[PDB]
Ligand binder design. Structure first.
Ligand SMILES: *[C@@H]1O[C@H](CO)[C@@H](O[C@@H]2O[C@H](CO)[C@@H](O[C@@H]3O[C@H](CO)[C@@H](O[C@@H]4O[C@H](CO)[C@@H](O[C@@H]5O[C@H](CO)[C@@H](O[C@@H]6O[C@H](CO)[C@@H](O)[C@H](O)[C@@H]6O)[C@H](O)[C@@H]5O)[C@H](O)[C@@H]4O)[C@H](O)[C@@H]3O)[C@H](O)[C@H]2NC(C)=O)[C@H](O)[C@H]1NC(C)=O
Ligand SMILES: *[C@@H]1O[C@H](CO)[C@@H](O[C@@H]2O[C@H](CO)[C@@H](O[C@H]3O[C@H](CO[C@@H]4O[C@H](CO)[C@@H](O)[C@H](O)[C@@H]4O)[C@@H](O[C@@H]4O[C@H](CO)[C@@H](O)[C@H](O)[C@@H]4O)[C@H](O)[C@@H]3O)[C@H](O)[C@H]2NC(C)=O)[C@H](O)[C@H]1NC(C)=O
Ligand SMILES: *[C@@H]1O[C@H](CO)[C@@H](O[C@@H]2O[C@H](CO)[C@@H](O)[C@H](O)[C@H]2NC(C)=O)[C@H](O)[C@H]1NC(C)=O
Ligand SMILES: O[C@H]1[C@H](O)[C@@H](O)[C@H](O)[C@@H](O)[C@H]1O
Ligand SMILES: O[C@H]1[C@H](O)[C@@H](O)[C@H](O)[C@@H](O)[C@H]1O
Ligand SMILES: [Fe+3]
Ligand SMILES: [Zn+2]
Ligand SMILES: [Zn+2]
Length: 341
């Protein structure tokens, strides 16, 4: 066997990867980059093998020839008896979240408010909400819609980064990695929870995992679900229990990608790695758990039950679905058939 070189995005992922490398006995090793885009370039050069990507990034990687290998699979209810690895993925719900106390803020009065985004180019944090906003406003000036934002990956001197905080020292403001205080699902929800923004564009799971004591993190300790509302497209506000009827879209699960010529090798290694360090793995929680990182979703989402085989050997377009692909295509017209690298 050859080793698999995993690509870690930023210093916190690098630390988790190093631990996994040690525990795997160097069956997995680590390369590190500052952004997801740079990790994708590493994979293309053949300097790294794989990383787990949000749907929006799978689109970028796909244009450049990378293929989906295995998908994150979280808890379900349907397909009960079927093993996690073979169970179809269900997809997550992209939602827009506000404080209950911010009364009369609805989908239709979002203009000139403050926004919290997981990162530019990501499914729930960006592509879905901004795609809808462009369509509804007939304008590609989505950078003038919100008064101020935190959208990791945008220009640090623009309004889109105005609310981003950087790291401990206030360095790396708006970098699309976990060094940025408000990056990712948990970061964007924190941006709302601390009332830096009026709205966060996250997924349904984020609200549940960071309220009612599900998170012992300082800022999330006292957060109650009832203090939050979801914004529906029909102009209403619902309790966070109603996400099935009040979401902006269903997103395809985050998935491991690699170069096509390395796909089968990456697959084999990962299946074995999860038997050891996965949810009921030999060595988890005794030595190391691949799918834990204390609420920080490092390398993988913390709610990941397993990585699932795909079936139908999907291309990246099949994986993302024709609905989502055309949504992205239409939005990319603002800022068509190539590879950004
Ligand atoms: C937005 O995000 C949230 C966070 O991701 C989502 O909430 C999460 O939902 C999942 C399920 O989708 C939860 O997992 C469950 O958590 C339970 C409690 O911790 C766990 O323990 C039990 O598991 C049992 C087995 O499932 C459950 O017993 C039954 O299970 C079966 C189906 O498997 C059913 O059987 C029925 O029982 C009926 C009894 O009245 C009977 O009348 C019927 O005839 C039938 O026999 C039944 O459904 C029943 O539940 C038991 O209920 C417990 O759940 C378990 O592991 C389970 O998987 C997460 O815990 C939730 N996360 C959090 C933090 O709350 C939310 O779903 C999502 N929203 C949307 C719309 O997607
Ligand atoms: C922003 O605005 C953009 C412009 O309006 C939006 O893009 C448009 O999005 C539409 C929906 O994704 C595209 O239509 C495509 O899907 C159609 C429906 O597919 C079929 O639907 C029927 C009924 O539900 C099913 O029975 C069937 O199985 C298909 O799923 C397509 O119509 C059909 O396509 C099939 C292809 O196999 C064809 O055989 C049929 O004859 C029939 O024509 C259609 O072809 C499209 O693929 C629009 O094309 C698209 N517009 C543009 C400019 O591309 C965008 O979504 C908006 N953004 C957001 C975030 O919402
Ligand atoms: C590192 O990879 C190797 C190869 O998969 C593993 O070593 C053994 O592989 C052989 C042949 O495939 C199997 O018969 C054994 O099951 C493996 N050894 C054991 C004891 O399980 C090895 O498991 C990997 N090491 C770690 C820690 O991930
Ligand atoms: O596909 C994406 C997208 O086009 C972004 O606008 C660009 O900043 C990224 O580098 C690219 O990978
Ligand atoms: O249309 C289907 C669907 O998108 C599945 O998720 C994928 O696994 C299949 O390969 C594809 O044919
Ligand atoms: Fe996502
Ligand atoms: Zn829906
Ligand atoms: Zn196919």
């Amino acid at each position: 066997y050859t080793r698999v070189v995993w690509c870690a995005v930023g210093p916190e992922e690098q630390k988790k990867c190093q631990q996994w490398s040690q525990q795997s006995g160097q069956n997995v090793t680590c390369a590190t980059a500052s952004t997801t885009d740079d990790c994708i370039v590493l994979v293309l050069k053949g300097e790294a093998d794989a990383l787990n990507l949000d749907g929006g990034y799978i689109y970028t990687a796909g244009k450049c020839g990378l293929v989906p290998v295995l998908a994150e699979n979280r808890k379900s209810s349907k397909h009960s008896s079927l093993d996690c690895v073979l169970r179809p993925t269900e997809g997550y719900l992209a939602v827009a979240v506000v404080k209950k106390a911010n009364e009369g803020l609805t989908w239709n009065s979002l203009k000139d408010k403050k926004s919290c985004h997981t990162a530019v180019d990501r499914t729930a944090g960006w592509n879905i909400p901004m795609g809808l906003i462009v369509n509804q406003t007939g304008s590609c000036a989505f950078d003038e819609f919100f008064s101020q934002s935190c959208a990791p990956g945008a220009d640090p001197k623009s309004r889109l980064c105005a609310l981003c905080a950087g790291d401990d020292q206030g360095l790396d403001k708006c970098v699309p990695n976990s060094k940025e205080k408000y990056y990712g699902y948990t970061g964007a929800f924190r941006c709302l929870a601390e009332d830096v923004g009026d709205v966060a564009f996250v997924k349904n799971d984020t609200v549940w995992e960071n309220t009612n004591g599900e998170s012992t993190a300082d800022w999330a300790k006292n957060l109650k679900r009832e203090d939050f509302r979801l914004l529906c497209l029909d102009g209403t506000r619902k309790p966070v229990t109603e996400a099935q009827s009040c979401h902006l879209a269903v997103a395809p699960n985050h998935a491991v990608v690699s170069r096509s010529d390395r796909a089968a090798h990456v697959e084999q290694v990962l299946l074995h790695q999860q038997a050891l360090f996965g949810k009921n793995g030999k060595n988890c929680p005794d030595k190391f758990c691949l799918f834990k990182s204390e609420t920080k979703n490092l390398l993988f989402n913390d709610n990941t039950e397993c990585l699932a085989k795909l079936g139908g050997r999907p291309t990246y377009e099949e994986y993302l679905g024709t609905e989502y692909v055309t949504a992205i295509a239409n939005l990319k017209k603002c800022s068509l058939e190539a590879c950004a690298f």
